[PDB]
Amino acid sequence: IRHRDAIISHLNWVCIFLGFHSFGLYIHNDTMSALGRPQDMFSDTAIQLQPVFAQWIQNTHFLAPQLTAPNALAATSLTWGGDLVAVGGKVAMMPISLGTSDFMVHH
Amino acid sequence: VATYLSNLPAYRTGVAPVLRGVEIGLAHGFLLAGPFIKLGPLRNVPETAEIAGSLSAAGLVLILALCLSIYGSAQFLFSADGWSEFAAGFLVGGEAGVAWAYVCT
Amino acid sequence: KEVGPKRGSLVKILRPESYWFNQVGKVVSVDQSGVRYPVVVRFENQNYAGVTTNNYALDEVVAA
Amino acid sequence: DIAGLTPCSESKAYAKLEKKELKTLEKRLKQYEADSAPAVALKATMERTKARFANYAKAGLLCGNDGLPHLIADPGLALKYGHAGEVFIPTFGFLYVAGYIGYVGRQYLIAVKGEAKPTDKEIIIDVPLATKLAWQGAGWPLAAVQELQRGTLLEKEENITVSP
Amino acid sequence: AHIVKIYDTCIGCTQCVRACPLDVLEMVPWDGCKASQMASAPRTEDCVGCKRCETACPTDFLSVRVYLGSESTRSMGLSY
Amino acid sequence: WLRDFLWAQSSQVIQSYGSALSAYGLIFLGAHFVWAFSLMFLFSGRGYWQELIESIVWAHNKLKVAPAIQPRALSITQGRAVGVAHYLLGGIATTWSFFLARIISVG
Amino acid sequence: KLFPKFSQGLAQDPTTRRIWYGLAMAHDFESHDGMTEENLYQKIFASHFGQLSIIFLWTSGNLFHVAWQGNFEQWVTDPVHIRPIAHAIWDPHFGQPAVEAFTRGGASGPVNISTSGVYQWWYTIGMRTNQDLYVGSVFLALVSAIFLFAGWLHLQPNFQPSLSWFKDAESRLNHHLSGLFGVSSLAWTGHLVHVAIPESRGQHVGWDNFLSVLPHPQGLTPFFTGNWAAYAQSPDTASHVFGTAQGSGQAILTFLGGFHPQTQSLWLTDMAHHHLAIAVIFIVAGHMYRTNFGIGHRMQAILEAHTPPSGSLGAGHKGLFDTVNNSLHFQLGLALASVGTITSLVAQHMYSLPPYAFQAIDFTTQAALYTHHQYIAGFIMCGAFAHGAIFFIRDYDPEQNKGNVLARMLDHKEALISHLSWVSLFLGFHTLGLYVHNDVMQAFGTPEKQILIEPVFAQWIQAAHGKALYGFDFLLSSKTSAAFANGQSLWLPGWLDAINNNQNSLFLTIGPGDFLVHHAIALGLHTTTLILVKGALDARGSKLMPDKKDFGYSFPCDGPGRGGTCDISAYDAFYLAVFWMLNTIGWVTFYWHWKHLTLWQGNVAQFDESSTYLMGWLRDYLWLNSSQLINGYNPFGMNSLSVWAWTFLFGHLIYATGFMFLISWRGYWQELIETLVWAHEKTPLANLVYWKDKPVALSIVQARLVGLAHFSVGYIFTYAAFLIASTSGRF
Amino acid sequence: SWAPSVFVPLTGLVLPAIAMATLFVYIEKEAP
Numbered sequence A: 001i002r003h004r005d006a007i008i009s010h011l012n013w014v015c016i017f018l019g020f021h022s023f024g025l026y027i028h029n030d031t032m033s034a035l036g037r038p039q040d041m042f043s044d045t046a047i048q049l050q051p052v053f054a055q056w057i058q059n060t061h062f063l064a065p066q067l068t069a070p071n072a073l074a075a076t077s078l079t080w081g082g083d084l085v086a087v088g089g090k091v092a093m094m095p096i097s098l099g100t101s102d103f104m105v106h107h
Numbered sequence B: 001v002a003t004y005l006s007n008l009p010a011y012r013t014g015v016a017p018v019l020r021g022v023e024i025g026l027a028h029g030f031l032l033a034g035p036f037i038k039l040g041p042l043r044n045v046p047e048t049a050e051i052a053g054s055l056s057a058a059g060l061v062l063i064l065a066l067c068l069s070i071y072g073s074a075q076f077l078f079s080a081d082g083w084s085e086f087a088a089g090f091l092v093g094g095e096a097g098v099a100w101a102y103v104c105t
Numbered sequence C: 001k002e003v004g005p006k007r008g009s010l011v012k013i014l015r016p017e018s019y020w021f022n023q024v025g026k027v028v029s030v031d032q033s034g035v036r037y038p039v040v041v042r043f044e045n046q047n048y049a050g051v052t053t054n055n056y057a058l059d060e061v062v063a064a
Numbered sequence D: 001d002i003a004g005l006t007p008c009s010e011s012k013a014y015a016k017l018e019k020k021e022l023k024t025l026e027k028r029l030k031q032y033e034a035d036s037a038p039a040v041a042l043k044a045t046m047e048r049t050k051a052r053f054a055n056y057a058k059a060g061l062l063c064g065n066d067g068l069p070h071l072i073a074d075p076g077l078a079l080k081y082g083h084a085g086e087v088f089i090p091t092f093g094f095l096y097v098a099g100y101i102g103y104v105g106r107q108y109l110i111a112v113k114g115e116a117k118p119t120d121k122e123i124i125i126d127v128p129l130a131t132k133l134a135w136q137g138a139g140w141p142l143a144a145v146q147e148l149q150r151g152t153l154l155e156k157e158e159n160i161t162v163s164p
Numbered sequence E: 001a002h003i004v005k006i007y008d009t010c011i012g013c014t015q016c017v018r019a020c021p022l023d024v025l026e027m028v029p030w031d032g033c034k035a036s037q038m039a040s041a042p043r044t045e046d047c048v049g050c051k052r053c054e055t056a057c058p059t060d061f062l063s064v065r066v067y068l069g070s071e072s073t074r075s076m077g078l079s080y
Numbered sequence F: 001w002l003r004d005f006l007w008a009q010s011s012q013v014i015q016s017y018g019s020a021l022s023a024y025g026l027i028f029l030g031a032h033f034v035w036a037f038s039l040m041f042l043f044s045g046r047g048y049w050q051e052l053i054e055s056i057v058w059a060h061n062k063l064k065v066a067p068a069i070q071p072r073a074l075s076i077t078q079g080r081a082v083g084v085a086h087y088l089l090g091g092i093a094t095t096w097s098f099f100l101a102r103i104i105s106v107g
Numbered sequence G: 001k002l003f004p005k006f007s008q009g010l011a012q013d014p015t016t017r018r019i020w021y022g023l024a025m026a027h028d029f030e031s032h033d034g035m036t037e038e039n040l041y042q043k044i045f046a047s048h049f050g051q052l053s054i055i056f057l058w059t060s061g062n063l064f065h066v067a068w069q070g071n072f073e074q075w076v077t078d079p080v081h082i083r084p085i086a087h088a089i090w091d092p093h094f095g096q097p098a099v100e101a102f103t104r105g106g107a108s109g110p111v112n113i114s115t116s117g118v119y120q121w122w123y124t125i126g127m128r129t130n131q132d133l134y135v136g137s138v139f140l141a142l143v144s145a146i147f148l149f150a151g152w153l154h155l156q157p158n159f160q161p162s163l164s165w166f167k168d169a170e171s172r173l174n175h176h177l178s179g180l181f182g183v184s185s186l187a188w189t190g191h192l193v194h195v196a197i198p199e200s201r202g203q204h205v206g207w208d209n210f211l212s213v214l215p216h217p218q219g220l221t222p223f224f225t226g227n228w229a230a231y232a233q234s235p236d237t238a239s240h241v242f243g244t245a246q247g248s249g250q251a252i253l254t255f256l257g258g259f260h261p262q263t264q265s266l267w268l269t270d271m272a273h274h275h276l277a278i279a280v281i282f283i284v285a286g287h288m289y290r291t292n293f294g295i296g297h298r299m300q301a302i303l304e305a306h307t308p309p310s311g312s313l314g315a316g317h318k319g320l321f322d323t324v325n326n327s328l329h330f331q332l333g334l335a336l337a338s339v340g341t342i343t344s345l346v347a348q349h350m351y352s353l354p355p356y357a358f359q360a361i362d363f364t365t366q367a368a369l370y371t372h373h374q375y376i377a378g379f380i381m382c383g384a385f386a387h388g389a390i391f392f393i394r395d396y397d398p399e400q401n402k403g404n405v406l407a408r409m410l411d412h413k414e415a416l417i418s419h420l421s422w423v424s425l426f427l428g429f430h431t432l433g434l435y436v437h438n439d440v441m442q443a444f445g446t447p448e449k450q451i452l453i454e455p456v457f458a459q460w461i462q463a464a465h466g467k468a469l470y471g472f473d474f475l476l477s478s479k480t481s482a483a484f485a486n487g488q489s490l491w492l493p494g495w496l497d498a499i500n501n502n503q504n505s506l507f508l509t510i511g512p513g514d515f516l517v518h519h520a521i522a523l524g525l526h527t528t529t530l531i532l533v534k535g536a537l538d539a540r541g542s543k544l545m546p547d548k549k550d551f552g553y554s555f556p557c558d559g560p561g562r563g564g565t566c567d568i569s570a571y572d573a574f575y576l577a578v579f580w581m582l583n584t585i586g587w588v589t590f591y592w593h594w595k596h597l598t599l600w601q602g603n604v605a606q607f608d609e610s611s612t613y614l615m616g617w618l619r620d621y622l623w624l625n626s627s628q629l630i631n632g633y634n635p636f637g638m639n640s641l642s643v644w645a646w647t648f649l650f651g652h653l654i655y656a657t658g659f660m661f662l663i664s665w666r667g668y669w670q671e672l673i674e675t676l677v678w679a680h681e682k683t684p685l686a687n688l689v690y691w692k693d694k695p696v697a698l699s700i701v702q703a704r705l706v707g708l709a710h711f712s713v714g715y716i717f718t719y720a721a722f723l724i725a726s727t728s729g730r731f
Numbered sequence H: 001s002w003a004p005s006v007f008v009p010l011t012g013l014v015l016p017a018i019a020m021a022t023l024f025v026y027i028e029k030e031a032p
Ligand code: CLA
Pocket: A012, A015, A016, A017, A018, A019, A020, A023, A024, A027, G653, G656, G657, G658, G659, G660, G663, G664
């Protein structure tokens, strides 16, 4: 209670920062796609914002049956990597790639 | 930090606002030249990226230097003439810093 | 003598800025002094502030 | 044909739309065994559908170019051309029940104003008084015009105003 | 500053003064009611206009009455 | 997100009429109703509606049908509660009908 | 400390709402410090000169940008297969596909396709070259500068008018009927006869030869003789090519009705006879009044004698001239009511009776003009009631208005508001009930169970105007009646051949969707007047607040007491009516746009089957026609609709931002701004930078105005992007 | 032909920069 002003002021700052640097990326992509400038967008075929940390966590959880969980016959899910389980002609689960739009929506 | 804040020019009371504005200008010039020169609209040209990233940076320094004199005529270092000397020193120092960023390419 | 209505008579309010204008309440007491608003009327209709009683003058008061 | 229209028993878009609905129901019916429980309900839907088309064509409803029945909401074009059951008969079949409810609630309010505290019998409705006013409110237009002839339907300028 | 006027419909039950969060109001001797007292607004420079006084007035068509006027640094309720 | 998600995937809730999904076609309209209905409560304020209730309490006084429980407008924090409740209901049920009519059909 | 020079109380405000209210009550001249009534009238007179100069500068800018960056001379040669050009685009932020996408209309740089209709209006009044348009731009720039000089000089004390000069209502209503309306329309007929008629026949009449080219081959002899029918002998043929002399014709004042067969527009000859006839009638009505010459009529005598006895209107119209002349908000309210109704009249009669050549072939122009003047009319009609509410607080005097119509209006204000409440509640109950009924019938696969009430009452009016599609055969569609027979040579056959054409907008054929949406429009009109009339009549007081006139027009509330008084003011009842106004005009323009889209595509049955139920409005109009809109840009590329793809989202962004001022209210934000003040005043090296105005949150009334402003701007920008892209994408 | 390349930066970057300056200085003036 005696530093609620510091708490709410720094959270005000980080909300304004996240707002600009998350939604302004979408406004930037709108503007560049509307101005005939698709190379200047934020995408995979443009300025890339790769989620390096979540991709690294996907690699470690796909390689977890190798040496960090040696009694696992497979990974704990299929989202980390590998093949797809297909049941009845429909995909039960397959690996999930995380790209620039995944970065933008997580922020 | 009470020791570290006694170093940077905005708190050094015993130095002139002209040299204060000059050191602030050159210390922000090659900083703000960076986002225009590394990732601006004309990046993938190895002739014009370092030219446009410096010309837009010098224009932004000119905007900030006009905006300082606007603040000085608004508010009244803490005088009407000391902030004008601060604004002129920042104009000269910031354009010198943008030129120094174009030098160290 | 006792000026005003009696102790429990029904009455009609003529104060146009009141909540109970043209509306019938019971007199509960009339103050016998030089008070500007002696007639105390209690209503079943409560106002927006939740109050059922108000003082009124003698010209703002008419029986039935 | 009142206003560019046509009888639904005459128009072909109406019969084409009937055949369209029966075609959808038929291709839906073709998946099931003929005596199973979904097929009985699908054939009952077909029977209700065909009865609906027959009784809309029987009553003389007017179709348009779309093949859909229309409602002539004017007396003198409904009375003259036999369309009074479209709007002109239910515009009194409604208003009897509307003024019925508006009379029953009116009399329930007026018959509960003169009590000790009325509000307790508005959240906790006096059911024998309510059902007595429910049954005896059947002749409400009669009692409404007999109340209007007194002036006991309205209230005079004893009502509450602000600052005219 | 805001305009805080009171009127002679006051019954002197001193509820506006207890409701006042700024000590704008105070009770003055008077001879128009049974309580022999009427409110006053000597300190309308400190008024913010929050109208707690006329949430507490019992008289129909309130005896205290705040009129929102010009705003100083005290009428805006600023610690800054 | 407008084209390829809202416009493109609403193409099964909007033409769901005449099918088993048509209730999802109705609720998608109805929750578009309730949501917008909430904006009557969120944008407006009590001192309007209390005076409108005064002007119709006059009409119920004139025809001797004023109720003994006196009609009041909703409270301030009641009207805010009604507005946020109808807003949440109309948005979430819109997305409910959109999701289910999309994914029962194409999934 | 200085900026509200008009408000010394705002000048002492240390906060940041000093700026916001210096911008907002700057033109509320009556609340200024030291204001008298004479200085009031003088500032209003100078303000009207400023508005006139801005209107003329705006029109001259339209003319100059069309003459310079447009293709008007190219459009004259082919007004059907060439899009008009508003102005060129210089946007340095463009990429190369955006530069190549906005080059069309035969230009070289990027351009905008004008939808304001100005080429069709200028081409039919005689403009053919760009040099005709530069002269117009220079003339209107000179006239705008003259009005700026006039607004400067009539503020100077040798030229400042008296207090008594402005209250000459008699001379003003004389001169603005005779001179400003009659002589101006006579001069416009002089422009039509001398210039627009021969240029429509292909003869150049400019400023060099108008004293040498006769409009009529025997001119001014039939006018002085008496045989005026000589001015209508040979009209333009049905094979007339507009702008040329191929089957030209020689009449100047004809009376035909119907449309030109090429341009699908009104003939210029009977538009000339129109403006001449109403010029004569305005001159006759403008020599009615008694100013300074003994004959005529007086405004002081006609009003206070029209009083009906036996309690009909009370004391009638006794005492109005003391209150119409003295109040400006009453005059502004009547003026805004009249202008906002005749703006709806302009909108309704410029689509059905298009007055300009090759209008109603340019579909996007027609949609933009209709929607434009309908929203202009909606805002002006809600402001009529706004200033009518300002009248009752600031200007109304009950002791001056003892017993007249203006006091009887307040006397039974509860009856007015309760009957508007009944009509709105009935219309909304049954319109929404029939739409939800038709939606439930369409959902269950049973379209035949719909309530499809045929619009009998308006089909009867179309058949009485000569539409033989419904068979009511009453007056003009009956070949045997007297109103049919006594006009067969005068004005009827072109009008009858123009109604019965099913491809113009002249009395469109109507069905149950048009029943339902005209009752939606009646719901919107009655509810908007419910909110506005309730704000105007409760402006002086209510049972919740009997002294609302003591607080003025605009104020937040009266606090949390007495149950809570949010939005209690008359300003806050204008406020809630702007939402229902935008709703109503959105319904009329949704209905206009979709009935015309299905007309222009050909399939009016696609409207007639779908407009009966709200899902058909959602997916066959909103979902369907916003395909090429939202595909203005995509990851494949972009096209010329991308600027409407952006604005459609831009309008979606402003609209929602309005809700931030609408749902969130002030006091959350003041508590947030106090923590920001803490963070700024405790940050190292940002303590040096300090404000001059103390940061506060936006006030309550200001929060209303900002949320309403963003709501309206996002509403208009969304529907403008949708309307222009949805029409000009497929056409 | 050089007019849209000159008048548009002046009207949007230069003359509003005067208007962002001169109309702001007028706000906070101390009244004599
Ligand atoms: C689309 C609508 C919309 C938008 C843009 C905002 C915007 C915002 N809201 Mg908000 N709000 C909204 C609707 C919206 N609200 C509604 C409907 C409600 C109703 C309940 C609220 C309730 C609400 C509360 C209760 C709170 C907010 C907060 C915020 C702020 C957090 C975001 C931020 O700082 O990021 C930065 C800003 C943006 C992302 C906005 C867009 C800016 C773009 C990306 C770029 C800037 C433009 C660019 C410079 C060009 C300028 C042009 C020049 C001519 C000026 C921001 C001002 C919070 C706040 O202020 O604390 C942080 C907060 O506490 N809002």
